[PDB]
Design a protein around this ligand. Structure first.
Ligand code: SF4
Lengths: 290, 628
């Protein structure tokens, strides 16, 4: 299975999970039931950026699966791969929205789940200033808790805002990493779809700071690529869904670095086994100056 | 039918009609319906019992020549002789280059300009370098290269980029190359009356001969030219007939051998010659190149390219060419007649290529610079005979970027290498983009023009289709010059013609979507590149999604090139049918059975859009075989 086929398989799995969870939400709560994220002004940010539509009820959430379906075209060209990554991102957002409408408190501490607009505005000032020179999106599991803690604290000591997805949260807790918004170590959630909660940070950064109106998807992608200094460090074995989510990060212009053997793409998808050089490799790949 | 897609070409054809001079198009029209027997390759003249012609349609008419040779035998022998002639042309070019290398000296006209390249080549030839004088090394390297041409005992020396698997496959098949002249002689011997009358064996002998061109003759010529005249790097130039200057002396270098054109370029900066050009009433000296010698001087110095093969006559039709200096190969003899209608001095310089009624000034290899200065002085003095009322230079020229040797490509690829990962100075970024599928493949577009095809149409259509399908294109020769004239050799072309993956790659690496890798002998560079990629991936060259295209080929050299490209394991599309349709067995060998032998085969397709589609499908199926 080559890179394109891996991304397409991951996007289809994300679509299947989104369809299942949306069906569950339709069964339990009804199509008139409200759909929203806590304290946001852009409804579902990824769908709002891609199309301009605001998802307000469960029926509209079910109708948003058509966006995911139309974004998956299985032809081995780079544009289709980027669109398939975006389909995975939209599907992950739909899954997170369904989680919020199904459970009153989908995320428990230390996971924070969705990040509200006021937090985005608070982080915007140090973002453009340079006190936050980048965003380290750490996903998966490191071979040890010690190495995960070392990498996370290296990013933290450099001022980067690091977000954690997956078992790396538990490894960092075992590694005595101090977490919080002021400490710039944000645990999003144990599921892969929780990575969307940092993706919407970038998307809304284009909506708030950039002033790009909803539906101008190319302008949003250009803004995230040229303004948001985010990158992905994917540790541990990578499923097709993880690779598809990484394709979404690449579509947003965010390079993906991993310790796994993957079909490398220069400046976009890079393998770095040496955990002692992962921080420097990511800073170089994202062109970050400390 | 239109004669060309190039507007400057069309304007000069109108001028040639007004001036009452004949062109290659006019002679093609005069030839009318060409002989069917010769077109199918079923005519034989190998002995004076003939001429013999057998039916191109099996089961009808005369079946055998007088000696009993079948249509397949006649076709296979004709094809083999074309391969032998092409191999001879390329090998003679490389032999001259090696002899020039053998005569290099510190204080002479010919020096060593790339010592690192010479040391790497010496490593490839098992020549010691440490603690040695550079010219002693150069002479030893030249001796080894010369031995490759005529050694009768032992094995020849092949470049390290050639995969071990490909060499083992050649040895098992029986096509492993011997000395170049020995293989040419073997082909000529086996086509003699009453020798080889088996099509498969004949084709295998021709493949064996073509390998000595691709991997020994052209390769050594290219690498020694780099050693003596400098490795090409990315450089700007201008292309098409508009580069001629009305108010300057115009000196057009046509041919293939680079030593003469290098010495002419050096002589053009001589203060006495510049002063002489001023004194004859010209603003200066304007050197322009055509065909492969133009490609060489343009790759290494940015000399403007006046035009490719079927434009050579039109260069004279402008009435502005004060001197036309030619060495060997692809020099239309009609030029001698044509220059009578203008003031142009048509100067032959090589004992290998005498042309009747041209001015012969033998280029002296013993004193190359002085000889080049004398020839250039004749061209400059001819400026006084210019008739400015007969001058018409089209205001059509195009910016081009070239100089993409393998070394230059590797240097460009270093830009997209993460320093914390590495390694540097490899083809690894290219291998990565090919394996990931961001690039679907790489295609080489090579070859001449041919009056049978609208000039430059097939080259341009094939190149645009390939780059639109995210296939990166490397170009050589007259195809490269067609791309230069059209405007494809530009960074802007990436966003104008390329597909998404290739546009992203071009933006990241800062290269045009079409890479000009030099002259016809510089096709060896392409081989080198492919080999490196294969050696990096641990596979044979036949496992890669690569292809070669000759949309508008005419020469025996093109036949030899396609043969050795296929024998190396690279599928080749021919835009002009070779004279083999009369032999069904030969057609079946070249287009079907060759894949069993060497993993690649010929594709005959005269429609460029269909050729692009077939190339994409073949690359995709090879990718699926490879798992990428
Ligand atoms: S070699 Fe045979 S087929 Fe050819 S001309 Fe002589 S007799 Fe005829």
């Amino acid at each position: 299975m080559n890179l394109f086929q891996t991304v397409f398989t991951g996007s289809k799995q994300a679509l299947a999970a989104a369809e299942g969870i949306v069906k569950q939400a339709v069964d339990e709560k009804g199509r008139d039931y409200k759909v929203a994220f806590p304290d946001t002004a852009y409804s579902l940010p990824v769908i709002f950026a891609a199309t301009g539509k605001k998802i307000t009820n469960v029926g509209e959430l079910e109708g948003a699966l058509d966006i995911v379906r139309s974004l998956i075209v299985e032809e081995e060209m780079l544009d289709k791969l980027l669109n398939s990554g975006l389909a995975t991102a939209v599907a992950a957002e739909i899954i997170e929205a369904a989680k919020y409408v199904l459970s009153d408190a989908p995320y428990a501490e230390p996971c924070v789940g969705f990040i509200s607009d006021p937090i985005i505005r608070s982080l915007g000032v140090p973002l453009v200033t340079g006190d936050i020179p980048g965003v380290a999106v750490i996903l998966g599991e490191c071979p040890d808790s010690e190495t995960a803690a070392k990498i996370i604290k290296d990013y933290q000591s450099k001022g980067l805002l690091t977000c954690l997805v997956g078992k790396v949260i538990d490894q960092a807790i075992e590694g005595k990493v101090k977490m919080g918004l002021d400490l710039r170590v944000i645990p999003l959630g144990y599921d892969v779809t929780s990575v969307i909660h940092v993706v919407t940070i970038a998307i809304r950064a284009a909506l708030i700071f950039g002033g790009i109106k909803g539906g101008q998807l190319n302008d949003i992608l250009k803004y995230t690529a040229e303004r948001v200094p985010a990158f992905v460090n994917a540790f541990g074995p990578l499923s097709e869904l993880v690779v598809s989510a990484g394709a979404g990060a690449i579509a947003l212009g965010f390079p993906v670095l991993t310790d796994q053997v993957v079909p490398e793409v220069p400046t976009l998808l890079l393998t770095q086994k040496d955990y002692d050089k992962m921080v420097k490799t990511s800073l170089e790949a994202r062109n970050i100056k400390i | 039918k239109a004669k060309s897609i190039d507007q400057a070409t069309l304007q000069l054809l109108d001028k040639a009609k007004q001036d009452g001079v004949e062109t290659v198009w006019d002679r093609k029209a005069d030839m009318k319906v060409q002989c069917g027997f010769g077109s199918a390759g079923v005519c034989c003249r190998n002995c004076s019992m003939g001429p013999c012609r057998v039916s191109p349609v099996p089961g009808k008419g005369v079946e055998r020549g007088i000696c009993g040779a079948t249509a397949d035998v006649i076709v296979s022998r004709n094809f083999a002789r074309m391969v032998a002639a092409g191999t001879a042309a390329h090998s003679d070019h490389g032999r001259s280059i090696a002899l020039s290398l053998y005569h290099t000296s510190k204080d002479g006209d010919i020096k060593v300009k790339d010592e690192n390249k010479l040391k790497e080549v010496a490593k490839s030839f098992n020549v010691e370098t440490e603690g040695r004088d550079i010219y002693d090394i150069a002479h030893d390297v030249a001796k080894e290269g010369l031995s490759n041409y005529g050694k009768q005992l032992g094995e020849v020396t092949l470049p390290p980029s050639l995969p071990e698997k490909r060499k083992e496959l050649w040895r098992k098949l029986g096509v492993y190359p011997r000395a170049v002249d020995r293989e040419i002689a073997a082909v000529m011997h086996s086509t003699h009356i009453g020798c080889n009358a088996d099509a498969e064996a004949m084709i295998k002998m021709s493949m064996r001969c073509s390998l000595t061109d691709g991997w020994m003759g052209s390769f050594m010529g290219t690498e020694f030219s780099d050693i003596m005249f400098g490795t090409p790097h990315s450089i700007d130039t201008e292309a098409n007939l508009g580069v001629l200057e009305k108010n300057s002396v115009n000196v057009v270098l046509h041919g293939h051998e680079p030593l003469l054109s290098e010495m002419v370029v050096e002589a053009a900066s001589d203060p006495e010659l510049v002063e002489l050009a001023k004194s004859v009433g010209a603003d200066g000296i304007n050197l322009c190149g055509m065909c492969c010698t133009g490609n060489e001087v343009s790759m290494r110095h940015g000399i403007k390219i006046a035009g490719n093969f079927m434009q050579q006559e039109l260069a004279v039709v402008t009435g502005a060419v004060d001197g036309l200096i030619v060495d060997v190969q692809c020099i239309m003899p009609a030029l001698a007649k044509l220059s009578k209608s203008y003031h142009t001095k048509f100067i032959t310089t090589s004992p290998k290529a005498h042309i009747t009624d041209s001015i012969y000034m033998e280029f002296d290899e013993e004193n190359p610079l002085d000889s080049a200065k004398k020839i250039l002085k004749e061209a400059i003095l001819n400026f006084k005979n210019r008739d400015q009322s007969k001058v018409m230079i089209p205001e059509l020229k195009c910016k081009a970027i070239l100089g993409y040797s393998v070394e230059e490509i590797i240097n460009k690829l270093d830009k997209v290498v993460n320093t914390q990962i590495g390694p540097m100075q490899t083809v690894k970024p290219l291998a990565d983009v090919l394996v990931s599928g961001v690039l679907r493949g790489a295609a080489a577009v090579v070859g001449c023009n041919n009056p049978k095809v609208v000039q430059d149409s097939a080259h341009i259509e094939t190149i645009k289709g390939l780059i639109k399908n995210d296939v990166i294109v490397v170009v050589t020769g007259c195809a490269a010059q067609a791309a230069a004239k059209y405007g494809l050799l530009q960074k802007e072309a990436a966003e104008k013609y390329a597909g998404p993956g290739l546009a992203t790659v071009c933006k990241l690496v800062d290269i045009p979507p079409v890479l000009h890798m030099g002259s016809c002998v510089d096709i060896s560079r392409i081989l080198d590149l492919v080999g490196r990629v294969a050696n990096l991936l641990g596979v044979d060259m036949s496992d890669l999604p690569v292809a070669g295209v000759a949309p508008e080929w005419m020469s025996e050299k093109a036949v030899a090139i396609g043969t050795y490209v296929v024998t190396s394991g690279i599928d080749t599309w021919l835009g002009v049918a070779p004279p083999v349709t009369g032999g069904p067995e030969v057609v079946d060998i070249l287009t079907n059975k060759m894949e069993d032998w060497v993993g690649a085969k010929f594709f005959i397709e005269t429609d460029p859009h269909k050729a692009v589609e077939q190339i994409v499908n073949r690359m995709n199926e090879k990718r699926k075989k490879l798992g990428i």
